[PDB]
């Protein structure tokens, strides 16, 4: 039960070494419940990156 | 980066303050005009000056610019 979320806004580089990015995701179906999540690899807007678990927000990384 | 220096920024705004009626929004024409208006030692500096003069003219046509 993976959920797909297109990214609509790239928030910014976070983490100690800057290797992880805060990004703003929007769900493909039920276009609401917009969430802030962290991503490891390089990210542009309009990435359909999938989420193993959905019920969790994200904050700054140490 | 592509940040122009003061030797091109002030030389371009002297051109605008001195030959605004003769200037235009075309780089090729501005490039030829500044070659007969100013004594530029190098072609690269001439093109940089004309490209920023063209940018400033394009910005002046959209409204008043500060400092010129």
């Amino acid at each position: 039960p993976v959920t797909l979320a297109k990214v609509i806004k790239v928030l910014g580089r976070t983490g100690s070494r800057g290797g992880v990015t805060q990004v703003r995701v929007e769900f493909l179906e039920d276009a609401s419940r917009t969430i802030v999540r962290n991503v490891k690899g390089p990210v542009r807007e309009n990435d359909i990156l999938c989420l193993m678990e959905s019920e969790r927000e994200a904050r700054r990384l140490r | 980066g592509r940040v122009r220096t003061k030797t091109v920024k002030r030389a371009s705004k002297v051109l605008i303050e001195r030959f605004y009626p003769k200037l235009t929004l075309d780089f090729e024409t501005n490039k030829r005009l500044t070659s007969e208006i100013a004594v530029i030692q190098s072609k690269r500096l001439r093109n940089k000056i004309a490209g920023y003069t063209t940018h400033l003219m394009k910005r002046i046509q959209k409204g008043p610019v500060r400092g010129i």
């Binding site: 962290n38 991503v39 490891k40 690899g41 990435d47 359909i48 990156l49 990384l61 140490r62 | -």
Partner: protein, 206 residues
């Protein structure tokens, strides 16, 4: 369809390429589709090529790698470990033979099997480290589609390389076995053990 007679005679099979551009003039991209919505834009199969050797400039900008053919990214990743750097013709030979073995086995389209193994080998959540100046700390984060694809290619070629090291089995058929196993999701294969262990640690950090 007509055969065009030139003063310099041109073989029949290559004259057949006028109808369609095919990988090694043998494999078609038309009936190949990525079984994942999130990696469609990062697995490039829309522009057919004849040979996986284009000598393009995909390292200039940030996301130019997504425009390189997925098979060319695989043959680029094959040439590793010092003694093989720069040996692209050898890598292309390996890929060309591997595709034929993937064709005689399971009879599917070899580049469809390649696409399935790449979509099936990339971990969807990786546990990045957030250690504060020495202390051990891990946080589970998502994996971008580009890094998911190119980590799939890295793991697929690493697994084929290690399976072919000090083994009578040749590299082309170690790559063929690795690609087939990852395409069908078998846990016996490398890059599926790695993918499961990666997503397991990420599950143990969120």
């Amino acid at each position: 369809l007509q055969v065009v007679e030139l003063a310099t005679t041109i073989p029949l099979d290559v004259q057949e390429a006028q109808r369609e551009v095919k990988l090694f003039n043998k494999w078609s991209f038309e009936d190949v589709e990525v079984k994942d919505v999130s990696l469609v834009d990062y697995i490039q199969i829309r522009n057919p090529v004849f040979v996986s050797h284009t000598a393009g400039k995909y390292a200039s900008k940030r996301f130019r790698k997504a425009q390189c053919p997925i098979v060319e990214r695989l043959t680029n990743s094959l040439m590793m470990n010092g003694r093989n750097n720069g040996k692209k013709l050898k890598a292309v030979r390996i890929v060309k033979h591997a595709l034929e073995i993937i064709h005689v086995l399971t009879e599917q389209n070899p580049i469809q099997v390649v696409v399935d193994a790449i979509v099936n080998s990339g971990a969807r959540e990786d546990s990045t480290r957030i250690g504060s100046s020495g202390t051990v700390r891990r946080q589970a984060v998502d994996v971008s589609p580009l890094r998911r694809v190119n980590q799939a290619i890295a793991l697929l070629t690493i697994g084929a390389r290690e399976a072919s090291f000090r083994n009578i089995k040749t590299i082309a058929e170690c790559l063929a076995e690795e690609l087939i196993n990852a395409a069908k999701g078998s846990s016996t294969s490398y890059a599926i053990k790695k993918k499961d262990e990666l997503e397991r640690v990420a599950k143990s950090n969120r």
